[PDB]
Every structure is written in structure tokens, then in C-alpha cells.
Short mmCIF file of C-alpha atoms and ligand atoms in Angstrom, two decimals:
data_model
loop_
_atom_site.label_atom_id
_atom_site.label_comp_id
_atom_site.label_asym_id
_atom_site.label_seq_id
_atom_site.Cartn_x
_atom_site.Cartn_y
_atom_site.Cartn_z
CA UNK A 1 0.00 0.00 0.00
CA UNK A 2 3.07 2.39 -0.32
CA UNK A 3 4.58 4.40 2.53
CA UNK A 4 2.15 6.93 4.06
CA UNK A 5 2.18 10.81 4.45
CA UNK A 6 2.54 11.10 7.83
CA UNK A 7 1.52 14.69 9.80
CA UNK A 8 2.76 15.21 13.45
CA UNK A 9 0.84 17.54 16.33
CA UNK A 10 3.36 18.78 18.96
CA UNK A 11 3.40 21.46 21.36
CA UNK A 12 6.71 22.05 23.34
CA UNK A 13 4.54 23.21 25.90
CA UNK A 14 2.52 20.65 26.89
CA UNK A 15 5.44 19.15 28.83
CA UNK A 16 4.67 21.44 31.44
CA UNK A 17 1.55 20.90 32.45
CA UNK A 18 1.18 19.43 35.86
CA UNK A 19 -1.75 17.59 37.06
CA UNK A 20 -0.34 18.13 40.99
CA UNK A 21 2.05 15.90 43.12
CA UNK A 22 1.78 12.63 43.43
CA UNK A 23 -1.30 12.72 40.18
CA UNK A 24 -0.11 9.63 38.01
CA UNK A 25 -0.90 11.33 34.42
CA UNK A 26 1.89 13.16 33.38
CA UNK A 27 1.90 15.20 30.23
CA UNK A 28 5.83 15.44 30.46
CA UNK A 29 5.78 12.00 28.95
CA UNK A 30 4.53 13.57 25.90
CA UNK A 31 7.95 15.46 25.64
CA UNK A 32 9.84 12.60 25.99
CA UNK A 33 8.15 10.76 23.34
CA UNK A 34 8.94 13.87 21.20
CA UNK A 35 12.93 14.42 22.18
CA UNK A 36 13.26 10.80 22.05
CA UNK A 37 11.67 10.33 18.06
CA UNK A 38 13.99 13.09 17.16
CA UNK A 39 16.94 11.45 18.42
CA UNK A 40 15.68 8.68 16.28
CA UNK A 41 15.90 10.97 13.13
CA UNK A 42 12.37 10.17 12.53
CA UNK A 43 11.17 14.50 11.78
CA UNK A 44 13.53 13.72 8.12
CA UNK A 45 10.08 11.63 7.70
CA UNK A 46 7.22 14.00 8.50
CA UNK A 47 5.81 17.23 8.48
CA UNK A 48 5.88 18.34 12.54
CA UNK A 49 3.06 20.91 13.02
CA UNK A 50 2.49 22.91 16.34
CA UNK A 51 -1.55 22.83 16.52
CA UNK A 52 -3.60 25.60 17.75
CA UNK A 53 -4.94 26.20 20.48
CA UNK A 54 -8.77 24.92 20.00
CA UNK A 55 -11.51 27.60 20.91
CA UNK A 56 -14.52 27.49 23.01
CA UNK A 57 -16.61 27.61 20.55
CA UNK A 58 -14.29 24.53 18.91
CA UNK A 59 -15.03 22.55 21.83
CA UNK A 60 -18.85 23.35 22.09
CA UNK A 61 -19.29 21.36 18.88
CA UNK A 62 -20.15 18.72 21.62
CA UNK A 63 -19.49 20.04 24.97
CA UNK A 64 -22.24 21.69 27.11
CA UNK A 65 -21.51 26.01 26.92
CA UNK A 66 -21.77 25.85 30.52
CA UNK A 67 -19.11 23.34 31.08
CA UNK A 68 -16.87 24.71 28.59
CA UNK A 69 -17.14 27.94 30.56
CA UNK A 70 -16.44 26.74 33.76
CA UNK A 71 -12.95 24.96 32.10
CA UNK A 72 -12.51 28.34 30.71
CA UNK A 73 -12.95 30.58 34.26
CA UNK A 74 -11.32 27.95 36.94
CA UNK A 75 -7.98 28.11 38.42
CA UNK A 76 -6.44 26.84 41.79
CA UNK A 77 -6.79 30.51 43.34
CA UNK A 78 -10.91 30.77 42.60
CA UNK A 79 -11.77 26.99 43.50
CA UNK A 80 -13.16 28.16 46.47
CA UNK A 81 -15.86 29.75 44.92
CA UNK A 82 -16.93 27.00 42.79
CA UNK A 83 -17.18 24.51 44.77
CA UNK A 84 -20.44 23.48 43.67
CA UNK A 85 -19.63 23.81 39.74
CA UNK A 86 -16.45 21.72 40.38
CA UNK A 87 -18.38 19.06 42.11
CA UNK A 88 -20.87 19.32 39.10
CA UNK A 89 -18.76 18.90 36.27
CA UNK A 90 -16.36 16.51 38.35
CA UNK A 91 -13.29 18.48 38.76
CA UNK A 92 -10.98 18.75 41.72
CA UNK A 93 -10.24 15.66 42.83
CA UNK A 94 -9.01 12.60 39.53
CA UNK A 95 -9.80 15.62 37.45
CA UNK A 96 -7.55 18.15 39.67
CA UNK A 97 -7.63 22.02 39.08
CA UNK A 98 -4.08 22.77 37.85
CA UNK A 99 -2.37 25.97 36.79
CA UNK A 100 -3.14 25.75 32.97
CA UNK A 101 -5.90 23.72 32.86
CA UNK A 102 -7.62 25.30 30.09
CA UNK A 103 -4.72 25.69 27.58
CA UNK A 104 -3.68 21.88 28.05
CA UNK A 105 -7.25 21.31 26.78
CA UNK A 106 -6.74 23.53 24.04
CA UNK A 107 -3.60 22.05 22.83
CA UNK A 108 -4.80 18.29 23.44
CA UNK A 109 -7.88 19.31 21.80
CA UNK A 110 -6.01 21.33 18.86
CA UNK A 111 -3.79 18.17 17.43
CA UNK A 112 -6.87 15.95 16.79
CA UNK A 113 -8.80 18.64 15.08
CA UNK A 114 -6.16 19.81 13.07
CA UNK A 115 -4.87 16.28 12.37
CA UNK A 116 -8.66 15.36 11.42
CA UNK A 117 -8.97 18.82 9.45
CA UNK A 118 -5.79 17.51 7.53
CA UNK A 119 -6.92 14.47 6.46
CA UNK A 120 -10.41 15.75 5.53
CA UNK A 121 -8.57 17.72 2.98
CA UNK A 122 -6.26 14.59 1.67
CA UNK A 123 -3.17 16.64 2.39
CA UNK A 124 -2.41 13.50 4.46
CA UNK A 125 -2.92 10.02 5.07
CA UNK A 126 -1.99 9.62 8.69
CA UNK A 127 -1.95 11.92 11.39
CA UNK A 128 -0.49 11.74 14.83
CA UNK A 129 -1.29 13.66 18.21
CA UNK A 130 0.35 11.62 21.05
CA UNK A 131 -1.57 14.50 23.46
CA UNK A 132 -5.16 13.51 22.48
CA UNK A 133 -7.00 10.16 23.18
CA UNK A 134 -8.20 11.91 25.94
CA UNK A 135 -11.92 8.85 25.43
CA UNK A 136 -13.61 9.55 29.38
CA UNK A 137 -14.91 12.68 28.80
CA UNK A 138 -18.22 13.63 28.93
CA UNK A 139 -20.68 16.41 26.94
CA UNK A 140 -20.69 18.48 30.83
CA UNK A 141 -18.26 16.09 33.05
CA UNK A 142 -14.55 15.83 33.32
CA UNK A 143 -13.45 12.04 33.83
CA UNK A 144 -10.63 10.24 34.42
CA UNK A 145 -7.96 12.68 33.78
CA UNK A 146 -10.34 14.03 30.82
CA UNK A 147 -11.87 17.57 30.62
CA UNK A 148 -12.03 17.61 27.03
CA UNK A 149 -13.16 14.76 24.42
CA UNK A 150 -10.53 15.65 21.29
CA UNK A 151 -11.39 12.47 19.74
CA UNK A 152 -15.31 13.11 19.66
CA UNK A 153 -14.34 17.07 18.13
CA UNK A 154 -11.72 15.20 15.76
CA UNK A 155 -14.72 12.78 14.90
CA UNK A 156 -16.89 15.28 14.27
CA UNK A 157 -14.88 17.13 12.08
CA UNK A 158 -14.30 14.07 10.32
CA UNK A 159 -18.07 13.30 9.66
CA UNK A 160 -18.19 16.58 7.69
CA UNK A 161 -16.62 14.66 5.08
CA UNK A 162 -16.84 10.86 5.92
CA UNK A 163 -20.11 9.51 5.88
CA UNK A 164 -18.70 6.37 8.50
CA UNK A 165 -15.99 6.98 10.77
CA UNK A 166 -14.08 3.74 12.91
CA UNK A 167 -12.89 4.42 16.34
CA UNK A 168 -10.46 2.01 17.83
CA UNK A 169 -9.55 2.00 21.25
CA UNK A 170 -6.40 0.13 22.68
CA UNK A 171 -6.41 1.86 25.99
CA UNK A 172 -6.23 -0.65 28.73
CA UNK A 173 -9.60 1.56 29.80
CA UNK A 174 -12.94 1.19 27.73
CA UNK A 175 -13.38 4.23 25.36
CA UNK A 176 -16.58 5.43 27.43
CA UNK A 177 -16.79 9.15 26.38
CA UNK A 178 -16.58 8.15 22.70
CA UNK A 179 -18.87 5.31 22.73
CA UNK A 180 -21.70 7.61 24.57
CA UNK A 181 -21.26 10.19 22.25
CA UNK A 182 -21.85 7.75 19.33
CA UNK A 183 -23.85 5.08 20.91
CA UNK A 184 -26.93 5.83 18.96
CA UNK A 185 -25.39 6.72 15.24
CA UNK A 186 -24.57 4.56 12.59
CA UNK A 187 -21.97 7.10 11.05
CA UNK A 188 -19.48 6.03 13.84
CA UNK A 189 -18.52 2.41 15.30
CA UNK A 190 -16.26 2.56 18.13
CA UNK A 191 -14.37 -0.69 19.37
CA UNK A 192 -12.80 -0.80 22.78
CA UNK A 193 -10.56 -3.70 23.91
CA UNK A 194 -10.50 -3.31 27.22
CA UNK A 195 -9.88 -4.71 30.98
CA UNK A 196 -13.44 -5.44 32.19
CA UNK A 197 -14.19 -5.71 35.78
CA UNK A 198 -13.42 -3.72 39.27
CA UNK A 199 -11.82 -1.56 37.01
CA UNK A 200 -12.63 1.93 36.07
CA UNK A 201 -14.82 3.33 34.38
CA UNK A 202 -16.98 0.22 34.89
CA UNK A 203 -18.55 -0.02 31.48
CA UNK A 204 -17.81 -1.74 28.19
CA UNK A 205 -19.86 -4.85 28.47
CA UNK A 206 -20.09 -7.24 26.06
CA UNK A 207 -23.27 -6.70 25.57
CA UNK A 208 -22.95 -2.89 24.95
CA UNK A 209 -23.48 -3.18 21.24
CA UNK A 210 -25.36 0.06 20.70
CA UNK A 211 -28.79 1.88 20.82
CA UNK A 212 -31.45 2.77 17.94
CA UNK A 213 -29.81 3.29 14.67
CA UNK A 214 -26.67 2.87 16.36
CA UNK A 215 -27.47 -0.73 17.94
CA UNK A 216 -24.68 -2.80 16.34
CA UNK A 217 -22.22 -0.51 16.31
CA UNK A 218 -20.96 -0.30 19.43
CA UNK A 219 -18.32 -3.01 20.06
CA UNK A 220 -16.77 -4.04 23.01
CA UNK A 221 -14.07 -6.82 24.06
CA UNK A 222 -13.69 -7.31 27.67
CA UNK A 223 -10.41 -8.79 29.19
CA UNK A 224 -8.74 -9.83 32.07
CA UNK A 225 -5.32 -8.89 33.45
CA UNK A 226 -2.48 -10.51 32.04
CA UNK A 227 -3.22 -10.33 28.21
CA UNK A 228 -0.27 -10.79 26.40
CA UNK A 229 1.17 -10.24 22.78
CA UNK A 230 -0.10 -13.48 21.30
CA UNK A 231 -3.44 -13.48 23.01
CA UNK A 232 -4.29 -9.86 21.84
CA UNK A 233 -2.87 -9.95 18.41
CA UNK A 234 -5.28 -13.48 17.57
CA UNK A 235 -8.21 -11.48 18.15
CA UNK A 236 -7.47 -7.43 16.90
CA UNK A 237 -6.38 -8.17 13.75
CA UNK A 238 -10.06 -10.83 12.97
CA UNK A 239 -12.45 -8.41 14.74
CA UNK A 240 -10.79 -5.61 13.13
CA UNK A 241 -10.88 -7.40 9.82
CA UNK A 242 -14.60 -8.10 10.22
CA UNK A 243 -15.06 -4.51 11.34
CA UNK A 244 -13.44 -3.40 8.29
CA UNK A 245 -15.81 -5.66 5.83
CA UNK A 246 -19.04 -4.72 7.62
CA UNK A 247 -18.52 -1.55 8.27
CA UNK A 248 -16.50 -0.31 5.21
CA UNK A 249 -15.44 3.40 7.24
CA UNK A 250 -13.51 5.81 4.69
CA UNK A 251 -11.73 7.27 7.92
CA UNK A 252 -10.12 6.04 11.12
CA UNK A 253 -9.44 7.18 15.08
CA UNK A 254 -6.84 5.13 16.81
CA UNK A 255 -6.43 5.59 20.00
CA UNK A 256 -2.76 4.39 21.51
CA UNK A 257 -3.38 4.41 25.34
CA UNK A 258 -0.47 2.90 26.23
CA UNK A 259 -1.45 1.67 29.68
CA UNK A 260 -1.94 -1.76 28.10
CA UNK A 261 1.62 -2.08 28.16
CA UNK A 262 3.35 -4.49 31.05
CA UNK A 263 4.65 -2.95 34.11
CA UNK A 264 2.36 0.37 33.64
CA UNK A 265 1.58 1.56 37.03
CA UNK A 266 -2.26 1.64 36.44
CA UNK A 267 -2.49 -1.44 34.09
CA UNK A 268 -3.11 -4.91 34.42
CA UNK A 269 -2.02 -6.15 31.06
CA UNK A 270 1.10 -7.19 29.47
CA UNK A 271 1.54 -6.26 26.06
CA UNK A 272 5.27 -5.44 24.87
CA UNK A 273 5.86 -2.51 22.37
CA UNK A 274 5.57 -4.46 19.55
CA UNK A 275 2.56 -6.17 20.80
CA UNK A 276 0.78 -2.54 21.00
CA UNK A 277 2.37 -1.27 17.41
CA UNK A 278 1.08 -4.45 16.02
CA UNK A 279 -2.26 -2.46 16.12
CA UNK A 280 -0.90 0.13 14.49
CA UNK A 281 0.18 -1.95 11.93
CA UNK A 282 -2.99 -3.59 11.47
CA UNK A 283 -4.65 -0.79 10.82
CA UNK A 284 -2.18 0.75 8.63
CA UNK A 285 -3.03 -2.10 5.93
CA UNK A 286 -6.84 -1.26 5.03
CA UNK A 287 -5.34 2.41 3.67
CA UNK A 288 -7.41 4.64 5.24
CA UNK A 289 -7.04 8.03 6.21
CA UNK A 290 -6.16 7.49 9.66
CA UNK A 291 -5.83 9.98 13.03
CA UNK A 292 -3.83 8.40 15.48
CA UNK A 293 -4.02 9.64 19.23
CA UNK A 294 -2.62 9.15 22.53
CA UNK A 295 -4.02 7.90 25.61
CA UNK A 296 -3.07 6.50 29.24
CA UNK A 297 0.57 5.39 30.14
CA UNK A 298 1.63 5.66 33.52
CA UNK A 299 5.36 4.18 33.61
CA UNK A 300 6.30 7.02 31.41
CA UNK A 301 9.83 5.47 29.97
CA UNK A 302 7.70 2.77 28.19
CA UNK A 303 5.14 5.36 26.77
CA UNK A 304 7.89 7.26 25.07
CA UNK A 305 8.96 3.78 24.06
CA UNK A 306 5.70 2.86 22.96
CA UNK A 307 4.49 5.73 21.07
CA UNK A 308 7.96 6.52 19.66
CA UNK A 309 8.00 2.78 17.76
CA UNK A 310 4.39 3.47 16.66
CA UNK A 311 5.55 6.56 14.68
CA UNK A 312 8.24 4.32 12.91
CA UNK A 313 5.39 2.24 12.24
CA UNK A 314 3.33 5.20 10.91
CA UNK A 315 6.42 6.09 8.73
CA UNK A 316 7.44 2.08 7.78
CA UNK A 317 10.89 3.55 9.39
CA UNK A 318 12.83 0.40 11.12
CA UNK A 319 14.35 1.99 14.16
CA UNK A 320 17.36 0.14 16.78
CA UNK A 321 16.33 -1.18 19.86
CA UNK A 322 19.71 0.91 21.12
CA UNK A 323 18.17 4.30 22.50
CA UNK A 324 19.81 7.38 21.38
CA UNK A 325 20.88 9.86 23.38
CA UNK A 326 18.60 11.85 24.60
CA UNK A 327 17.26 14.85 27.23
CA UNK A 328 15.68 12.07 29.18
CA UNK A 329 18.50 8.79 28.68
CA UNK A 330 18.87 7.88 32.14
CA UNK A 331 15.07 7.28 32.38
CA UNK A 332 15.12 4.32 30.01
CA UNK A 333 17.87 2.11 32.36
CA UNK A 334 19.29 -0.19 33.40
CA UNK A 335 18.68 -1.65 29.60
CA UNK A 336 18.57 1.79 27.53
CA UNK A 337 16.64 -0.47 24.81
CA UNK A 338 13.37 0.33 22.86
CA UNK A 339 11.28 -2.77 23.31
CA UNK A 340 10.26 -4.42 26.70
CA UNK A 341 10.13 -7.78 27.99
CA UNK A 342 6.57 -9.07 29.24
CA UNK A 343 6.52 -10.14 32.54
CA UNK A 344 5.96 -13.36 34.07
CA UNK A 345 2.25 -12.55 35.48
CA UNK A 346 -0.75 -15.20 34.20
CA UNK A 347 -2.92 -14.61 30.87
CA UNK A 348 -6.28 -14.56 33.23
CA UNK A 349 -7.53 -14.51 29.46
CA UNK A 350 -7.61 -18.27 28.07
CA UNK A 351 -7.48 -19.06 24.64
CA UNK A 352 -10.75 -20.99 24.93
CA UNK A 353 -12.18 -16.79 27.08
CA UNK A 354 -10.67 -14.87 23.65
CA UNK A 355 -12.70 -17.75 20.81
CA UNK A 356 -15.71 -17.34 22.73
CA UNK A 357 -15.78 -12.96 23.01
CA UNK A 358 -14.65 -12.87 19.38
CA UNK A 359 -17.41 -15.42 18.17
CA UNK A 360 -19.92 -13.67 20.20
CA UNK A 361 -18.40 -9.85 18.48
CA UNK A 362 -18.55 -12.04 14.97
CA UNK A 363 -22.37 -12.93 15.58
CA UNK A 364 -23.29 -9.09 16.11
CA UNK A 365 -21.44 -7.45 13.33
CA UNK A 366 -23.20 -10.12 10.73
CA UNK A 367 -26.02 -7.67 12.28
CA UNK A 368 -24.61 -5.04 10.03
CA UNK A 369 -26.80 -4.54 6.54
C1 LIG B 1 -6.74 5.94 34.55
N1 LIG B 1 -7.22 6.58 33.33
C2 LIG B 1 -8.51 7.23 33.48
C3 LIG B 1 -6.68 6.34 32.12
O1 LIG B 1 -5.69 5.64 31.95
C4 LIG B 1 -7.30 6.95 30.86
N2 LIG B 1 -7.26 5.92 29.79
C5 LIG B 1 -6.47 8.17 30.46
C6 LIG B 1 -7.16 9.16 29.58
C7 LIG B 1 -6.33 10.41 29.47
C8 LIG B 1 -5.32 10.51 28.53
C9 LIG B 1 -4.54 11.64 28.46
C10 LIG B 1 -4.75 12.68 29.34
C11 LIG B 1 -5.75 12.59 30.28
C12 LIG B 1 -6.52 11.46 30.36
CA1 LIG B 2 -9.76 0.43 25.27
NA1 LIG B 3 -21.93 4.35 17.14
ZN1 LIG B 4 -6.34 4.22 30.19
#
């Protein structure tokens, strides 16, 4: 299918946003996934493009006014007086008030809307913003670590040309924001692989498929901890193929949450790199315009990792498992290598769990006209 045009979103701000002391989400990871790709070389490949910062009224193409308004007006020194509007909208305690706020929204936020506004225009065939994926929030509610839904404004902007949009999520966490916002269209399918069970945000049943003209396309895989490389990668690339078939989208979301990964410090699963960018891959081989996003990640060395080897991917670029130098080296030890090594925890998800979720997934997408 040729190499791709690949268009990058990066601001060198977003690094500095700080959700608050010991608050596991840290944008600076975002950085190092930048400093570290251009060690690699990998900007002699693609066009890097600083995105905007996305508007209000940008953002109120699905979010409530009010709720956009509050993001807009609070800061650490006015919490006090809305304490009410914070409780509300859920924001002060996963969803901390930080200095900022707003902007890191609007940057987030920018990269999928420009990335989507590029590819709507066929000035490119892939684009990349490794600070979006941002799937739990809501229309008027932040949610974990979410204020504001990029993908769902990327989405949107991609319906204005696309008459069926594919969302695939690969966040260890089900896509929840994206699939409410969809959940009762046929113009977008969203797919969520996910850990199911005592786990946040408590949704993504199986049996989630959908509602009215959108029943059937809602699809959702639920998993236990321990899934590893071979386990995932014998059921994403049939579903996805099925998906593909059925469905027939002319444009694609990926989200990359890399919290799938083994050894994140939120996760459960244990995916290497290459297990994850095998997704990518995937796909990268139905050749369609394609916005790929960010996500969760909480051991931050393997999300640079991670989402580094997935813009290789993007760009068909082979890159060495020796690291470069880089501002952030001594984070990758004691190996200073690319790819990880699963661990030794158990597959809770047996071969005999994965052929019974996909046949199930198989039965409802024959649903599809
Ligand atoms: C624990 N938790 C909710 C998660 O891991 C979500 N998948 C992360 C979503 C996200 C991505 C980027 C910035 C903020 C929030
Ligand atoms: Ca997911
Ligand atoms: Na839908
Ligand atoms: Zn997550």
C-alpha cells in the first residue's frame, strides 16, 4: 500500500503541564516521546506541526456552553468559589484544578482537530497527536484525567466529510466518552478492547453493542489482566478485519493508550511494544485516512517507548532497539533499549475466554446490513 504521508501535532509546551504531586498522568511523557523520536531521526520523515490552540466555541461542537465555561474561568486561586460547579462537572479531585488547565485542553484538543482537518482535505494520510485520546470525557463532566473529548471534536470534524468513521480503542480503559457520544449513530462504530471488571470506568460490556440506529455498532471486548502479545494480536487483527468488511469506514481514530503495556503503574495487562504497534500496523493495511491519538501510560519510559515505535510504524521507518541519546536517557535504564520484555504474570484470558468474546463480536457485526 506504499509508505504513508505522515503529519505530526506537537506542542513544546505541553510538557509542562502538571496535574499536581503525586497525580499519576503526566503530560511530560509527551515530551519525551517527542525528544526521544527526534533522536531517532524520525522529523527527516514528516511534516511536525504545532496545533492551535482549539476555541470554546471549537469545543462546544459537543461540549455543554456551561461546562466549557467553567474549564474556561477555573484556576487553583478561585476553587473556592466554585465549589459546587467543580463538584458538578467533576473536577478537583481525579480531574484536579491545575495551573493551565484550560490551555492543556486547548492544545490536546487542537492536534486531533487539526490532524482530522488535515486528512479531511487529503493533504495526508496519517496523522499523529500523542496528546489527544483523551476517550472519558463527557458532553458536561470531566473524567478520568479528561476535561475535554478531542477524539469526539476530531470525529466530528471528520463526519463533515466521511459519511462512516471507525474508532479504535487500545487503551487498557474502555473508550466510554466516545462510545456515549456515538452510541446511537450509525456514522461512527467505536471498538474498545479493554480490561473489564473492578476496574474503572466500569462499562464496556459485552453486551454494549449500541442503541437505535446505532445498535450494532458499538463493540466491546472485555479482558482480564495478564493479556499478552499473542493473546491480543489473535483477536485485533479478525475483529478488526470483520469490522473493516461490515462496516466499510472511509476514515479512522486510533487511539494508543499505552497503559496496556506491562509494568504500567495503572495497568493490568502485558503487552510489549511491539505487541501494542502491532495495532498500528494492522490498521495501517486497510489504507485509510487514519488519526492516530494518545491515551493512558503511567510508567512514562515505556510510553515514550511505545508511542515513539508506533511513529516508525506510521512512517514504515525500522528503528534500533539501542536508544539514542537523549534529554531524558537515564530514564530508560538499566537496559537503555526500545522494546520491553513481558513479565511473568498469568494470561487470566484463556485461549478458549478470547474464541468465545470474538465469536460472540462475529455474531453481532453479521447484524450489520
Ligand atoms: C486511569 N485513566 C482514566 C486512564 O488511563 C485513561 N485511559 C487516560 C485518559 C487520558 C489521557 C490523556 C490525558 C488525560 C486522560
Ligand atoms: Ca480500550
Ligand atoms: Na456508534
Ligand atoms: Zn487508560
Amino acid at each position: 500500500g506504499g509508505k504513508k504521508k505522515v503529519c505530526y501535532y506537537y506542542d513544546g509546551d505541553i510538557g509542562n503541564y502538571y496535574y499536581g504531586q503525586g497525580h499519576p498522568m503526566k503530560p511530560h511523557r509527551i515530551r519525551m516521546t517527542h525528544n526521544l523520536l527526534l533522536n531517532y531521526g524520525l522529523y527527516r520523515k514528516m511534516e511536525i506541526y504545532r496545533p492551535h490552540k482549539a476555541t470554546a466555541e471549537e469545543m462546544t461542537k459537543y461540549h455543554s456552553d456551561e461546562y466549557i465555561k467553567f474549564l474556561r474561568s477555573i484556576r487553583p486561586d478561585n476553587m473556592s468559589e466554585y465549589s459546587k460547579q467543580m463538584q458538578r462537572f467533576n473536577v478537583g479531585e481525579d480531574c484536579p484544578v491545575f495551573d493551565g488547565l484550560f490551555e492543556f485542553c486547548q492544545l490536546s484538543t487542537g492536534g486531533s482537530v487539526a490532524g482530522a482537518v488535515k486528512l479531511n482535505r487529503q493533504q495526508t494520510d496519517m496523522a499523529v497527536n500523542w496528546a489527544g485520546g483523551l476517550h472519558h470525557a463527557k458532553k458536561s463532566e470531566a473524567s478520568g484525567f479528561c476535561y475535554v473529548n478531542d477524539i469526539v471534536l476530531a470525529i466530528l470534524e471528520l463526519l463533515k466529510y466521511h459519511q462512516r468513521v471507525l474508532y479504535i480503542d487500545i487503551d487498557i480503559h474502555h473508550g466510554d466518552g466516545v462510545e456515549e457520544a456515538f452510541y446511537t449513530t450509525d456514522r461512527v462504530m467505536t471498538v474498545s478492547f479493554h480490561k473489564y471488571g473492578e476496574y474503572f470506568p466500569g462499562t464496556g460490556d459485552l453486551r454494549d453493542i449500541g442503541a437505535g440506529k446505532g445498535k450494532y455498532y458499538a463493540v466491546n471486548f472485555p479482558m482480564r489482566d495478564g493479556i499478552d502479545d499473542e493473546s491480543y494480536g489473535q483477536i485485533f487483527k479478525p475483529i478488526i478485519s470483520k469490522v473493516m468488511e461490515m462496516y466499510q469506514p472511509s476514515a479512522v481514530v486510533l487511539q494508543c493508550g499505552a497503559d496496556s503495556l506491562s509494568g504500567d503503574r495503572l495497568g493490568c495487562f502485558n503487552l510489549t511494544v511491539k505487541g501494542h504497534a502491532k495495532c498500528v500496523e494492522v490498521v495501517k493495511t486497510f489504507n485509510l485516512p487514519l488519526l492516530m491519538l494518545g491515551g493512558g501510560g503511567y510508567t512514562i519510559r515505556n510510553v515514550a517507548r511505545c508511542w515513539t515505535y508506533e511513529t516508525a510504524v506510521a512512517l514504515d521507518c525500522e528503528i534500533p532497539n539501542e536508544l539514542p541519546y537523549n534529554d531524558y536517557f537515564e530514564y530508560f535504564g538499566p537496559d537503555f533499549k526500545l522494546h520491553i520484555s513481558p513479565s511473568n504474570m498469568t494470561n487470566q484470558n484463556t485461549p478458549e475466554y478470547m474464541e468465545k468474546i470474538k465469536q460472540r463480536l462475529f455474531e453481532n457485526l453479521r447484524m450489520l446490513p
